[PDB]
Amino acid sequence: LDNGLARTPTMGWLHWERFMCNLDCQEEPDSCISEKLFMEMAELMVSEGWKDAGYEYLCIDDCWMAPQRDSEGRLQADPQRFPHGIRQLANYVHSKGLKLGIYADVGNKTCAGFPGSFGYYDIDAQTFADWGVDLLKFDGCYCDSLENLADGYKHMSLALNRTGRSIVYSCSWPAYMWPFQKPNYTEIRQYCNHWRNFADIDDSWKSIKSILDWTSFNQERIVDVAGPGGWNDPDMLVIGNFGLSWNQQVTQMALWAIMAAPLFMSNDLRHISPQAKALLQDKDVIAINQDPLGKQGYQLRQGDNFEVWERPLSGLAWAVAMINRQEIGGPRSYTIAVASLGKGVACNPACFITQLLPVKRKLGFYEWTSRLRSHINPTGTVLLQLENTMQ
Amino acid sequence: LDNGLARTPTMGWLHWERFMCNLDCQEEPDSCISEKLFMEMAELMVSEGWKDAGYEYLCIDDCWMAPQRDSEGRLQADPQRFPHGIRQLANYVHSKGLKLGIYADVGNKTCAGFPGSFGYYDIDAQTFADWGVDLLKFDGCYCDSLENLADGYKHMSLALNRTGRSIVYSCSWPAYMWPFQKPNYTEIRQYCNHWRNFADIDDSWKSIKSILDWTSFNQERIVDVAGPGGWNDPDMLVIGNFGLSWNQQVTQMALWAIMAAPLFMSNDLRHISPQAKALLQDKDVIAINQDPLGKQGYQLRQGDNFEVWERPLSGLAWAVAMINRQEIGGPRSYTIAVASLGKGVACNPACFITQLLPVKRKLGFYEWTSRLRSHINPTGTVLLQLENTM
Ligand SMILES: *[C@@H]1O[C@H](CO)[C@@H](O[C@@H]2O[C@H](CO)[C@@H](O[C@@H]3O[C@H](CO)[C@@H](O)[C@H](O[C@H]4O[C@H](CO)[C@@H](O)[C@H](O)[C@@H]4O)[C@@H]3O)[C@H](O)[C@H]2NC(C)=O)[C@H](O[C@@H]2O[C@@H](C)[C@@H](O)[C@@H](O)[C@@H]2O)[C@H]1NC(C)=O
Ligand SMILES: *[C@@H]1O[C@H](CO)[C@@H](O[C@@H]2O[C@H](CO)[C@@H](O[C@@H]3O[C@H](CO)[C@@H](O)[C@H](O[C@H]4O[C@H](CO)[C@@H](O)[C@H](O)[C@@H]4O)[C@@H]3O)[C@H](O)[C@H]2NC(C)=O)[C@H](O)[C@H]1NC(C)=O
Ligand SMILES: *[C@@H]1O[C@H](CO)[C@@H](O[C@@H]2O[C@H](CO)[C@@H](O[C@@H]3O[C@H](CO)[C@@H](O)[C@H](O[C@H]4O[C@H](CO)[C@@H](O)[C@H](O)[C@@H]4O)[C@@H]3O)[C@H](O)[C@H]2NC(C)=O)[C@H](O)[C@H]1NC(C)=O
Ligand SMILES: *[C@@H]1O[C@H](CO)[C@@H](O[C@@H]2O[C@H](CO)[C@@H](O[C@@H]3O[C@H](CO)[C@@H](O)[C@H](O)[C@@H]3O)[C@H](O)[C@H]2NC(C)=O)[C@H](O)[C@H]1NC(C)=O
Ligand SMILES: *[C@@H]1O[C@H](CO)[C@@H](O)[C@H](O)[C@H]1NC(C)=O
Ligand SMILES: *[C@@H]1O[C@H](CO)[C@@H](O)[C@H](O)[C@H]1NC(C)=O
């Protein structure tokens, strides 16, 4: 989408995976979807380094709305959970140097069942603009046909544009086509800053595997179309939560960088371990994700329960990731010819290799004809950065 | 098996899951299956508190054998990887106050392909007893019929008995039978101290869920047959490795206590986190697993992605485990009437409830009509102990 936004993958925080649609502020006041939750996160995004690391969008997912539109046909914030309204929230978020995302739906209802925007695209567009909304995640639930799905995503795009406000537009369009029709990503990119392709992530290794396997199975179809201002969205980071082992968290952070995915944390910033904080704020790994060239990585090979993925970076550099998919035994030896990496050219005549994950460590110079040997933990990933010696 | 052993479930260390069949001491000398590997583990079992926590059996799984029997038809320890032999390893292990477990197979080969004991039950049994072995894990690969399986398992039981040495006998008998026939756990209990019921565990949440799910489904068949001298074996503890979140690890420790499972660590004692060590050596949770009553627990109810399991204990006590099976979102509140627990007698007229996992905490007294509310992490487990007030 040629709106000047998302020139690198968007970074921020999204409430959904961790907090979902908890509307019970009587029993669970510290975890229900309320203005207070978001004010608290915005404070922590500044004070604990998230903004500095580059996480700047603070994003409301589903279940912020009141059940009914108002008399003028507008979506209303829920009055008991957001008593001061979205405008005041946006102002508060803006006063911290952060940006506000919000959620709406292309069809008649949101997935959680609140008012959808079908029949109100322009009004909802105007409302968000006026409130000072900086990003819109637009879901594809309760949409009766694919014609109506496309038209809606397009109409809202144009609507957002006509407001004159810069708003990052995140679509779920191709996800709700699959596997009923073949998305045309040239069309989709004309209208969207990013797009979800696949099923909802959850807090599981099954989920991460399934997203990586789906992406590599479909990479020939979706990798080339991504770039500055138009990205593949494989959904949230679930690092720092409950259901992934440390090695599986690293795999996610490594592969989200390789994939040029937007980086939306979904966790509790009030209760996050120093290790998860460290991984999510890893400067070198974020730098890979935020590479200005915006060329999305891909799976180079699979075999023997190993996976090799690689991403072309700027400055004649490459990021390479090796995953161990064997979920039994110990760390496993993997050996690859550096001549196979970077389409032959990463290490011609030589390259310097730095391990970034799971720990940072310089490996040294590797000549074109040589071999790389790593030990990779079960469900873990080694992330390497290759620097050609031609500069 | 009425041999005086396994009066509470056996606790120890077993190499398989973490170290597998790594024969390459050229490239990976510190992780290949060798005598040094077991000697180190043995040193650490003493120095790092494992033996004191209760873990006493150090057990070699598959891939310790040379490819051929010797000229007298005996199995032999691989000469490169066990140059000093199994006898000297046993003496070393014994000298630390520990006990040696070893592996063999009822069929013609082991699962890794080394010599099986079919045709050599008496000789192998004698070999092991002469060597000073204290436990035998007997696998069921490469058997051609279910009769030979049952016969084999039975024969070896008698053979070990005939040696006159105390040897804990672990059978994979029913695991290998289940695809074709319902096992006779009354028969199996007669010959074995424990029996593996199901597919091999791995370092994954999927695996663990599938063991609990299988065990709960089949609990009417297997729960009551277990007791002192004869246990259900849901396979190895995999806490301290790679594939499980902290919450998932707590779930394993908890349910393995509820199920009165033998507790066999399969990890690297040389490289284990303090948090994993603390969980595995948790005295109060071990105490539940080692309850002298030896009645195995069971799933009380499931629903709404929750499970409640309970286990009866000596002294009118009960252990209760609540599992959150929803793998999305945050800690989830669960409310249960204590009157539902312990067949209605757990808190009649009242009980004192202590939380043991994930953190030890006293929750006070509870009348028979009162309700308990806990917050359970996704894939995590809260484990409680209930003391009746009579
Ligand atoms: C996925 O979606 C995209 C975006 O819509 C398609 O790309 C577009 O394809 C259309 C073909 O219908 C192109 O239209 C042409 O535009 C050029 C301008 O450079 C005109 O010269 C050309 O005009 C002729 O043909 C028209 C016939 O109706 C008449 O208007 C004229 O009188 C004249 O005869 C025609 O309008 C778009 O340029 C093109 N847009 C982009 C961004 O590339 C995809 O189409 C495929 O991929 C294209 C790159 C190209 O190779 C097409 O030939 C392919 O069909 C579409 N993908 C699929 C699978 O359909
Ligand atoms: C509504 O839709 C319109 C129509 O697409 C959209 O207009 C486009 O805005 C973008 C971004 O502002 C324009 O792109 C710029 O083009 C000029 C040259 O014409 C350049 O100077 C700009 O350079 C910037 O970005 C470059 C990216 O390569 C960088 O190299 C550089 O650092 C600059 O920062 C940029 O390329 C585009 O030309 C217009 N298109 C048209 C036809 O007007 C508008 O922004 C939308 N409005 C909203 C609010 O969404
Ligand atoms: C080979 O097989 C034979 C036959 O099964 C087996 O002999 C059995 O040994 C057990 C235990 O040694 C005997 O059971 C004991 O009986 C005596 C006498 O009444 C009791 O003292 C024992 O009670 C104590 O220990 C019990 C635990 O088993 C506790 O329940 C109790 O609290 C006591 O502390 C115990 O009941 C059993 O009598 C014989 N069986 C027969 C048929 O004789 C033998 O041990 C096996 N040999 C080898 C080497 O495996
Ligand atoms: C391990 O391998 C050996 C070697 O093959 C197996 O022994 C063989 O078992 C077969 C089939 O059970 C026996 O065949 C039988 O032959 C009789 C005729 O004597 C016939 O009436 C039966 O119907 C059957 O076909 C065979 O005799 C026997 N051979 C030897 C060398 O003893 C053995 O069963 C295998 N053990 C296990 C547990 O898998
Ligand atoms: C919403 O509902 C109306 C009537 O129930 C239907 O005609 C319309 O097509 C629906 N819109 C979408 C996009 O699902
Ligand atoms: C199981 O085995 C026992 C002991 O051999 C025997 O008495 C009984 O009949 C068997 N019962 C079943 C389930 O067939």
Q: How many Cβ atoms are within 10 Å of A55's Cβ, its own excluded?
A: 22
Q: Which residue of A has its CA nearest to B32?
A: A330
Burial annotation A134-150 (CB, 10 A radius, 16+ → b, else e): bbbbbbbbebeeeeebb
Residue A182 CA: which ligand is closest? Answer: 1
The two structure tokens encoding residue A231? 């990205």
Question: Nearest Cβ partner of A245 from B31, B243, B327?
Answer: B243
Q: Which residues of A are catalytic?
A: 139, 200
Residue B310's H or E segment, with its range, is strand B306-313
Put simply, the answer to whether B18 touches A329 (Cβ < 8 Å) is yes
Cα B244 to middle of ligand 1, angstroms? 50
Atom 1 in ligand 4: which residue has the minimum CA distance?
B108
Put simply, the answer to whether A242 touches B18 (Cβ < 8 Å) is no
| A67 upstream amide cis, omega within 30 of 0 | no
- The yes/no answer on whether domain A294-391 falls in CATH 1.10.645.10 is no
Question: Where chain A is broken, by preceding residue (C–N > 2.5 Å)?
Answer: none
From CA A236, how far away is CA A266, in angstroms rounded? 6
Put simply, the answer to whether A327 touches B379 (Cβ < 8 Å) is no
* Separation of CA A230 from chain center: 12
What letter does residue B56 receive in the DSSP assignment? -
Q: Return phi, psi of residue A232, to 5°.
A: -75, 130
Cα A142 to middle of ligand 5, angstroms? 8
Whether B5 is in the pocket of ligand 3, judged by its Cβ within 6 Å, is no
Q: Which of B387, B390, B340 is nearest to B368 (CA)?
A: B340
Q: How many Cβ atoms are within 10 Å of B58's Cβ, its own excluded?
A: 27
For chain A, the farthest-separated pair of C-alpha atoms sits apart, in whole angstroms, at 72
Question: Nearest Cβ partner of B206 from A206, A247, A377?
Answer: A206
Question: DSSP characters for A200-245?
Answer: PP-SSHHHHHHHHHHHHHTHHHHTTT-BTTBEEE---B-TTSSSS-
Cα B193 to middle of ligand 3, angstroms? 13
* Active-site annotation holds for B202: no
Residue A351 Cα, gap to closest chain B Cα (Å)? 26
**Residue B204: its chain A contacts at CB < 8 A?**
205, 327, 379
Q: How many Cβ atoms are within 10 Å of B179's Cβ, its own excluded?
A: 7
From CA A263, how far away is CA B10, in angstroms rounded? 47
Start and end residues for every CATH 2.60.40.1180 domain found in chain A? 294-391
**Residue B27: its chain A contacts at CB < 8 A?**
333
One-letter amino acid at B7 equals R
Burial annotation B62-88 (CB, 10 A radius, 16+ → b, else e): bbbbbeeeeeeeebbbbeebbeeebeb
Cα-based distances in Å from B170 to A114, A118, A360, B104, B134: 57, 64, 45, 10, 11
Judge contact between B381 and B321, C-beta under 8 A.
Answer: yes
Atom 40 in ligand 3: which residue has the minimum CA distance?
B2
Residue B64 Cα, gap to closest chain A Cα (Å)? 17
The structural architecture, per CATH, of the domain B1-293 is Alpha-Beta Barrel (3.20)
One-letter amino acid at B256 equals W
Exactly one of B62, B78, B139, B235 is catalytic; which is it?
B139
Cα-based distances in Å from B114 to A96, A97, A125, B141, B160: 67, 66, 71, 11, 21
Residue A78 Cα, gap to closest chain B Cα (Å)? 21
CB contact, 8 Å: B381 with chain A? no
Helical segments of chain A, H only: 16-19, 35-47, 50-53, 85-94, 121-131, 146-162, 185-191, 205-217, 219-222, 246-259, 274-280, 283-289
Cα B78 to middle of ligand 4, angstroms? 29
Start and end residues for every CATH 3.20.20.70 domain found in chain A? 1-293
Start and end residues for every CATH 2.60.40.1180 domain found in chain B? 294-390
Cα A187 to middle of ligand 1, angstroms? 11
From CA A13, how far away is CA A45, in angstroms rounded? 9
The two structure tokens encoding residue A7? 């020139």
Burial annotation B232-261 (CB, 10 A radius, 16+ → b, else e): bbbbbbbbbbbbbbbbbbbbbbbbbbbbbb
CB contact, 8 Å: B248 with chain A? yes
Cα A193 to middle of ligand 1, angstroms? 22
From CA A312, how far away is CA A291, in angstroms rounded? 9
The two structure tokens encoding residue A165? 């406000």
Q: Looking up tokens 């029993």, which residue turns up? A: A27
Question: Nearest Cβ partner of A18 from B18, B241, B330?
Answer: B330
From CA A15, how far away is CA A60, in angstroms rounded? 6
**Residue B378: its chain A contacts at CB < 8 A?**
203, 241-243
Which CATH number is associated with domain B294-390? 2.60.40.1180
Judge contact between A188 and A174, C-beta under 8 A.
Answer: yes
The two structure tokens encoding residue A222? 């979706």
One-letter amino acid at B134 equals D
Q: Which of B123, B20, B40 is nearest to B89 (CA)?
A: B40
Give the strands of the sheet with B168-171, arranged side by side.
Answer: B231-233, B194-196, B168-171, B135-139, B99-105, B57-59, B11-14, B263-265
**Residue A31: its chain B contacts at CB < 8 A?**
330
Burial class (CB in 10 A: 0-12, 13-18, 19+), A26: exposed
Give the residue, out of B3, B134, B154, B168, with the most ligand 3 atoms within 8 A of its beta carbon, to mutate for a pocket test. Answer: B3
* Resolution of the structure in the document, Å: 2.3
Question: How big, in percent rounded to 5, are the helix, strand and coil portions of chain A?
Answer: 30, 25, 45
Judge contact between A74 and A127, C-beta under 8 A.
Answer: yes
One-letter amino acid at A287 equals A
Residue B175's H or E segment, with its range, is helix B173-177
Cβ-proximal residues to A73 (8 Å cutoff; 6+ apart), any chain: A120, A123
At residue B340, the 3 state secondary structure works out as helix
Q: Looking up tokens 């077993």, which residue turns up? A: B14
Question: Technique behind this structure?
Answer: X-ray
Residue A191 CA: which ligand is closest? Answer: 2
From CA A251, how far away is CA B256, in angstroms rounded? 29
What letter does residue A77 receive in the DSSP assignment? B
**Residue A204: its chain B contacts at CB < 8 A?**
205, 327-328, 379
- With a CB-CB cutoff of 8 Å, which residues 361-380 of chain B face chain A? 377-380
Judge contact between B111 and B105, C-beta under 8 A.
Answer: yes
For chain B, the farthest-separated pair of C-alpha atoms sits apart, in whole angstroms, at 72
First-to-last CA distance in chain A? Answer: 33
At residue A304, the 3 state secondary structure works out as coil
One-letter amino acid at B112 equals A
One-letter amino acid at B163 equals T
Judge contact between A301 and A69, C-beta under 8 A.
Answer: no
